[PDB]
Amino acid sequence: GSSGSSGSESRGGRDRKLFVGMLNKQQSEEDVLRLFQPFGVIDECTVLRGPDGSSKGCAFVKFSSHTEAQAAIHALHGSQTMPGASSSLVVKFADTDKESGPSSG
C-alpha cells in the first residue's frame, strides 16, 4: 500500500481557498472562522453578497495549507444545516476542475 506518490506536475498553482454555501444571513466571518479554526489556522475569510445587500448564503475560506482545508471540508461538508435552510452546508474548493493553461500547447 505504497502511501503517497510523485509525478509530473503541470503549471497551474495551488488554490488554498474554499467555497462554502447554504448559509444564512445571520452568520458572519467570525462565526465560520471560529468553527473552522478548530480544524486549521485560516488565513483569510470572506462572505459573498449581492447588490441590494443580502448574503447569497455562501463564503470563501482560505487556509494556511491545503491539508487543513481538505479537513474543514469533509469536517463541515453537508454536515450542518444552518437555520431556515433544509439542506446541509455546501463546502467545496473554489476551483475544482478549473485550470487556466494549455495541456499540450
The CATH number given to whatever domain includes residue 35 is: 3.30.70.330
Query: How many domains is the chain built from?
Result: 1
- Mark 28-38 as b/e (b = at least 16 C-beta within 10 Å): eeeebeeebee
Q: How far apart are CA 43 and CA 64, in angstroms?
A: 5
- What are 15's three cell numbers? 488554490
Contact status, residue 58 vs residue 48, Cβ threshold 8 Å: yes
Which method resolved this structure?
NMR
Contact status, residue 13 vs residue 87, Cβ threshold 8 Å: no
Phi and psi for 66 in degrees, rounded to 5? -65, -55
Domain span including residue 79: 1-105
